[PDB]
Amino acid sequence: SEEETLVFFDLETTGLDTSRCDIVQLSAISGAQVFSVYLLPRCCITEGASQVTGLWVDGSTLMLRERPVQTVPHQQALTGFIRFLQNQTFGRPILVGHNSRRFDWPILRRVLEEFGLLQEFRSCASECVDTLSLSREMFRNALQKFSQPFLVQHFLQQHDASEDVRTLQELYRVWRPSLELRDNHTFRL
Structure with a gap:
């Protein structure tokens, strides 16, 4: 199938520095298909990251x-996510992630x-939708907060x-964003 598939993805990380933090969890859902792996980080998980995720080493x-x-080793974990995007969504995927432009995608x-996998990754998806900036537009003069836990509490x-x-995919379904709104919050990988 050449029709579009949405792939909601998210990371758990060792900290908040996008130029340095390692990935500890890499997860994605597309329809009913689920990918999710843990990784052993190559750096320290901050106390704050452990308080938020419960993850520690x-x-x-x-x-x-x-x-x-x-x-799962990093090489295999990242390759698995690429193979998921290549083979497991039954369409042509577009990524969707909350705060993806400023945090998860960097x-x-x-x-x-x-790990030498960026160009292969970019060959199986070309675009990403940022639901943080999208939700801020859709609820601009309406909501005071836009973090995913707040939004899940409010809408679900x-x-x-x-x-x-999974909850981001459900939020997106509830919000039913138009393509014209979505295009406002799509960026190229």
């Missing part, structure tokens, strides 16, 4: 609160480049990237 073991989680772009009445891509 015990030696070589990534932990989510009291429980170890299984990690981070993912940098990490992809470290309910920080794990696998849960968060």
Whole structure:
């Protein structure tokens, strides 16, 4: 199929510096198809990042609160996401991410480049929709806050990237953004 598929994606990271932080969780959903992997970071997870996500490192073991989680090496994790975009969405994907222009895409772009995978990635998706700036337009003089947890509480009445891509996809469905609005918040990868 040559029809468009939306791929909602999200990261959990070691901190807030987009030029430095590593990825600890990489997740995506497209319709019913789900991709989600944990990665063992190559740098320290900040105390603040651990407070928000529950993720911390015990030696070589990534932990989510009291429980170890299984990690995938960076090379394989990133290749898996590329293969998902190439083979698993049953259409031609466009990415969608909250605060993706200023945060998630700069981070993912940098990490992809470290592993020599950026150009292959850009060959399976060309564009990304930023639902942060989109929601700010759609609710410009209406909402006071636009963080995804606030929006999920407000619109769905309910920080794990696998849960968060699912609720972002549901938010997007509730909002039903027009293509003219979406185009205002689409950028090229």
